[PDB]
Symmetry: C5
Subunit: 278 residues, 5 copies
């Protein structure tokens, strides 16, 4: 398990696996009906605001959460372990944001004309590949936020106690593991840099309200997953963990400026090799 | 030929081919008359907006589509195939956007003075070179969008069924191939990262409504098309596929802020070599 | 030891230490109460403005200060010294800025709708690793600013005299050392480039009032601390000094646009090796 | 001089030539008088707008044109040719844009106060070095634009016929050579990527109306002119061609927001070597 | 001058440091914080033209180049010797200090809430200009102005007219090779007039950048880990003529805006230089 030896050679010593992770912006995949809520799939529901400085209770379907998948690798067996060497990853569908013919708040609000305002604002892109769940560190805007006690994993879920003022900075007690898809809000749970020895993660954030969204995509870019010692994530029990979130901004409706988060799916193609371990 | 062998040497073992792909923003090349619609060539027609949350019917000539060309390579036939090594590509005509003396919405709307507002807003630049058609993955803003059944290839064209809520995220069923110029809307069809083993594509997106357009151009830049194994796209049946879209933003008229998409043509110069295959 | 010799080899000759430094934006860690002030931890209190050109008296809890920590390394004693080779550092919690459901100034102020305006504006990111306290150089916007005498270390604290007009530019008399956490205002005290021979510091500033905050984070980036001669900071008396400030911008309230600074915590993982010295 | 052989060695086998090209924004160098039009030298005259969708008649002195110069090299004549190896090029005078004390549209228009608004907006920087005139490809915003017949070289000058709708995209008929300084409008004529085998060009465009101008300048940067085969432009008949345009944006007056283009001069220092040719 | 081998031995390499304070318009004196000294590090309030033909900026509203000449140790007892030694500038660590001070948003500038006169004191924003140079002789300057009609003061600033003894011509709005000078005095050459001359400066390295606009966010990086190489393409750094080393800079961060008629004041910051020099044999 611990001591890393030579690369295994011979038939089937290398494998490639691919997966797509759909975004988890708030509306679940079901109901599928385009008149019963399914029309919001790929988006959050309308963001609901605090009613006072002491009453902030966001609905679960307004909170983007981490996407995750655990993939099973070919059975193995000094022992052998699968080692993640590299990944090609791509966020797909930015071209869909060129739809400016819909019924969003129009650019000319005097005549109700122009174009349907495209998705704009705060953007958040993180992906990770590891041999165990992504380790998470909690940190919130407001320790007083009344997150729901059902259907979501928050700091109180883990500690069994209300949040404290330290949860607005780094409180080492407030940790979790990304072990469920669509359950851990991204405004609460961050990659833990004090752990994640067996995972590589890459994140970026751009804020603002009207910020132009930016994205690049190509099938020619490889992300190396080997550490400073030439060792990739080692997959415990032949399980490979993929984690991501890809927020593009908000669309804004014609009714009291209601905002809906927009997310996009992420492709992963991971190259793995067998590694001798002791 | 699946197995890639040595490079072919001797007379005419290397070739160089060039092409330009004109943009397909909505107005077709004909009619040519500058009073009958030809004056909009290089642009879309005026973007028409949804009339309700459930009534979004964009006209075909308001939707930018993929440009594509299939080029015939010198005849050949252990067999030989043409291998695309590199490409020099350039978007031509950004200097034309320095025309601020026209009849667009003026910069001083109070007095109808200043300059004619230049093209601004959302921008989209993708090119691809491959030995078969570019593989496409469908993904839309709104699965309820009522695209025309004739004159465009959309998800319904492929599936023979209405779009589903999954089409707003990644639905593996919604796939196509870029086999026709000016027919596949870019707000629907994206490069499929799960396929395109024999094509290289490079894309970028910048959104917003008044975003400054940015472009670089030079005859000194070479894009390598060789993969991680040193193998370029292999041209099946001696056909080379070029695909692109180059949206610079919109111009805005003096009449109810009507927007017209602006596109620019793309130059390709591809270097190819003969490769032994079996 | 001033003369640097060979690296020490053998058992325990290399060590790794980690720490997090919480931000010091103005509100202290106590009281912890989420009603009596603890709700502002990780933030400043409401920024108070000058009442005239000659009356600028900022409150201590409105002034972000440097974070610092002195870490004790393993006992060592031609002598040996600990040498800081490299650091992996990360600013944690940018995802928490995606909370736009609170009670900040809303994006639609006419109807009190839209979203809770996220953190925006001036940003400041500096970190340092050294074998002694970070050397500081004073420089202020206004030498007339009346800082509190107690509770902050300012130029007057050091000189025992009022600031002079030269303190608005570079005055070599106005120097200090970063020897206390949460005490040295970042609008006064800057890394001194004329000293810090035994410290590496890295800073950036982005100004403005509504500027989108930008942050990257990954566990794959290593910052080398070796100088041009291959020598890292040497830890005097086995003490390692970490210093930082990470301002993301301000939040704005619904009452007279009151601004509160937002800061985020910084993780450090330092690799050290024993060095022979004479 | 088709087959390129060895480099020539010996006395005077390498040479350096320098030149500055002044901008050609619309006002000619004469009259010199600062009351008769000379005050506009370095700028365009006030941009005049179309009066309808079918009446766009820009005046020649409102249209920036390409700068060019043909330089004579030392006499030479297996023959020898001058080969351009590299160029150091710089745009001079960006500091002059720090003049915000003039009579431009003020930053506070409510009270007519503040500062004189500095040059802002669309920017266009292109330079070329070659052994023959820069090859130009025509492309316009509007094929209906009524350019003057005398005083500018436009598409009609070349074809002897009105522009066609194809001229709004890539029309290979619409070609020219940059053989005159201050005559070819940059909104019409672009470097032709299908030609220019013996010229290197480098261009960039940034659009918008109030975009901050950006410029870097240093005497430490060398641009290599050698192609992929290590051969620079070969100077036919010992003539070296320099081409450029450097638009910084517009100034805006206090009278009906009249805009004037601003251009800056470009320095070139070219290193050339003698090459044996057959 | 033929450049030969590097000199070896005791004291063949040296490091020297200096800070250059900004020259935004208000001189260092008077020092009093009620008599004008409160503006040191800033310009005085920018005064505007009163017509298209009447543009008379005051000297204290015009940022000028900072410069310093440093004298290095004498190397040659006898200049008639066939082979001599010169100081060669190899590299420089340079840093603009004090961007953190722009985080003061608690002052009496134009406030961000103009309805209630609340919010924050608007931070420094707008046009930015960063140039530094290191050379073995003064920085060569090329004149180029926005307006050849600008009526600069004849005393207190070095302008094109100072040099030519004649009024500016329309050519001075583009490149006029007649309009040249050398940066031989601190706080005297306006940066809206005088630019590094790319046709000279063979013995100087300069690095400049400009970002315009009115409300543009200021951006700055600072670190003690970044070395700027001064060696040319042939491996030779600036050679110090008569052992003189020239440092030149300007670092404009933008303007602050007051509560009285949006009066703007330029803000500048000081720049640190640490130059590594070595002795070089020459003939
Ligand atoms: C429909 C509704 O009012 N829903 C409330 C919910 O109301 C419950 C109950 O469901 C309802 O039938 C009954 O009349 O009243 C009770 C109690 O009030 O109560 C919950 C609180 O637990 C919410 O307040 C909920 O409101 C919805 O909350 C969503 C976030 O959870 C979101 O903001 C909804 O807003 C949208 C939406 O996302 O669905 C925003 C969207 O832009 C709108 N679409 C269009 C085309 O206008 C829709 C739309 O108005 C409704 O979905 C149509 O019914 O709302 C918000 O309604
Ligand atoms: C002219 C018109 O109304 N066209 C309609 C079209 O109407 C047809 C037919 O043309 C008309 O004579 C008849 O009365 O009605 C029938 C059908 O009822 O119907 C189609 C839908 O079937 C469209 O509604 C069409 O309207 C045009 O739609 C275009 C998008 O497909 C686009 O928005 C047009 O808008 C522009 C244009 O691009 O042509 C915008 C442009 O900026 C305008 N130019 C100027 C200088 O103002 C032009 C211009 O107003 C018209 O083309 C008239 O010359 O319109 C939109 O008109
Ligand atoms: C509460 C108050 O007035 N505090 C004053 C303080 O007043 C003291 C004393 O506390 C008070 O009981 C008594 O009436 O008066 C004495 C002094 O005469 O005096 C100090 C100066 O010595 C300050 O003037 C202080 O005012 C606070 O100053 C803070 C900066 O130091 C800051 O601006 C406070 O503003 C906030 C805050 O950060 O606490 C801004 C925040 O957004 C507000 N929150 C909400 C939800 O509205 C709070 C809030 O109004 C109060 O904290 C609730 O009491 O204020 C500012 O109050
Ligand atoms: C002076 C004038 O009206 N010029 C016209 C010109 O008019 C001629 C003739 O000169 C005039 O005496 C007579 O009454 O009418 C004839 C027309 O047959 O006609 C040409 C077209 O043939 C133009 O319309 C011209 O107008 C000028 O056009 C320029 C573009 O070519 C430009 O827009 C001029 O605008 C400026 C300028 O650049 O000179 C803008 C500038 O900001 C202004 N400066 C100030 C300080 O206000 C000047 C200024 O108003 C005048 O130049 C002062 O005479 O104009 C535009 O005038
Ligand atoms: C005070 C004044 O009017 N100064 C004039 C100057 O006037 C002289 C003399 O000083 C005065 O006593 C007498 O009445 O008139 C004579 C002759 O006119 O004249 C010169 C021109 O020769 C200027 O017009 C000067 O005005 C000053 O010009 C400066 C630029 O050179 C600058 O714009 C001054 O503006 C500021 C300043 O920088 O000092 C802007 C600053 O924001 C202001 N500070 C505050 C806290 O408001 C100050 C302030 O108003 C004055 O300094 C206090 O009197 O002015 C501008 O005044």
């Amino acid at each position: 398990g611990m001591e890393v030896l030579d690369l295994v050679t011979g038939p089937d010593s290398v494998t490639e696996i691919e997966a797509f992770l759909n975004p988890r912006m708030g509306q679940p995949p079901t109901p599928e009906s385009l008149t019963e809520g399914g029309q919001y799939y790929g988006w959050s529901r309308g963001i609901n605001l605090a009613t006072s400085d002491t009453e902030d209770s966001p609905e679960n379907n307004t909170l983007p959460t981490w996407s995750m998948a655990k993939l099973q690798l070919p059975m193995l067996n000094t022992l052998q372990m699968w080692e993640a060497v590299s990944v090609k990853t791509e966020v797909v569908g930015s071209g869909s944001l060129l739809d400016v013919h819909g019924f969003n708040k129009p650019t000319d609000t005097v005549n109700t004309k122009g174009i349907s305002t495209p998705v704009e604002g705060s953007q958040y892109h993180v992906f990770a590949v590891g041999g165990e769940p992504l380790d998470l560190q909690g940190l919130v805007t407001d320790a007083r936020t009344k997150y729901k006690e059902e259907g979501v994993v928050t700091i109180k879920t883990i500690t069994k106690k209300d949040m404290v003022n330290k949860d607005q900075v780094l409180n080492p007690i407030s940790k979790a593991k990304l072990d469920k898809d669509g359950m851990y809000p991204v405004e609460i749970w961050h990659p833990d840099p004090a752990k994640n020895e067996n995972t590589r993660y890459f994140g970026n954030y751009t804020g603002g309200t009207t910020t132009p969204p930016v994205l690049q995509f190509t099938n020619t870019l490889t992300t190396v997953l080997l550490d400073e010692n030439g060792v990739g994530p080692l997959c415990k029990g032949e399980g490979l963990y993929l984690s991501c979130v890809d927020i593009m901004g908000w669309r804004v409706t014609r009714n009291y400026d209601v905002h809906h988060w927009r997310g996009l799916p992420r492709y992963f193609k991971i190259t793995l090799r067998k590694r001798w371990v002791k």
